[PDB]
A paper describes a structure:
KPN03535 (gi|152972051) is a putative lipoprotein of unknown function that is secreted by Klebsiella pneumoniae MGH 78578. The crystal structure reveals that despite a lack of any detectable sequence similarity to known structures, it is a novel variant of the OB-fold and structurally similar to the bacterial Cpx-pathway protein NlpE, single-stranded DNA-binding (SSB) proteins and toxins. The N-terminus of KPN03535 has a lipoprotein signature, indicated by the presence of an LSGC motif, as well as predictions from LipoP 1.0. In conclusion, the crystal structure of KPN03535 reveals a novel divergent member of the prevalent OB-fold and suggests that it is most likely to be a nucleic acid-binding protein.
Residue numbers in the entry: 36 to 154
Amino acid sequence: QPGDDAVASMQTYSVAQFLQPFTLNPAKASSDYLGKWVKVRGVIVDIRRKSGIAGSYYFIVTMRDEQNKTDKRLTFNFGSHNSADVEALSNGSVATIVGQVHQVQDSTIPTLQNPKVVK
């Protein structure tokens, strides 16, 4: 996972910007981004705790473009160990979250993994 100074050093994408390549070809985009970390800024529109498999639970955080420059939403999957970050977000509030691209299947939009709320 990237630490604070590595995070401050990354470019901030809008949701529209990060999703643009996936809109063109998600197979290609998923392959180009595989394993990479992105820092995406947007408005949180849903936060939800979910029942996991094998005793676990996790959270899905959904984000829309800050200026509605796309209607597509980006989701992030936070494990139970990062409930502090999830509990500090707010629906309707702008946030910036760093997350990792894992393989995108059965979908055209990635669900960012191992996320970290920046601000």
